[PDB]
Structure 1
Amino acid sequence: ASAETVQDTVVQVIEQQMNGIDNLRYISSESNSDGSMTITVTFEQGTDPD
């Protein structure tokens, strides 16, 4: 599918739910043309990544 369908279909609700995690820095995303999609959520330092 195209970029706008993925962007208002998947990224909306996953980025909606991935607030409310404590100790965040910024929640950013990316919705590509060929059906790829990624969300890179960044935590402040002093948090064990596991």
Structure 2
Amino acid sequence: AEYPGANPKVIAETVATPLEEAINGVENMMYMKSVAGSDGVLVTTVTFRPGTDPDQAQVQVQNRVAQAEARLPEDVRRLGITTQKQSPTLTLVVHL
């Protein structure tokens, strides 16, 4: 999620906290972590136990985010929230 101009503190309060409130409680979850930087971008990672199907968990987390849609401020709302299954580590880098 993105919040242009907001400090990391408010993002962890009015953005990260509502999302963590609705995201906690998914099946086969192992641990979670959320990072809110000074650039105004919030990143939240949910890690499940090995052997879990990534596809079924991806829609579940997106549904949880939609459940907390109203809690978000309008400025965040108009930019949207992106929920994607994604490896947090680089696979390959192409240099131009």
TM-score for the superposition, normalised by structure 2: 0.50
TM-score for the superposition, normalised by structure 1: 0.92
Deviation at 1:48, TM superposition (A): 1.0
What is the RMSD of the two structures over their aligned residues, measured on CA atoms? 0.7
| Structure 2 unmatched runs, 5+ | 1-5, 56-96
Amino acid at match of 2:16: V
Q: Which runs of 4+ in 1 moved over 6 A?
A: none
User: More helix per residue: 1 or 2?
Assistant: 2
Identity of aligned residues (%): 42
C-alpha deviations, 1:2-44, integer Å up to 9, x for none?
1111110100010111111010000111000010110010000
Q: How many residues get paired?
A: 50
User: More strand per residue: 1 or 2?
Assistant: 1
| Structure 1 unmatched runs, 5+ | none
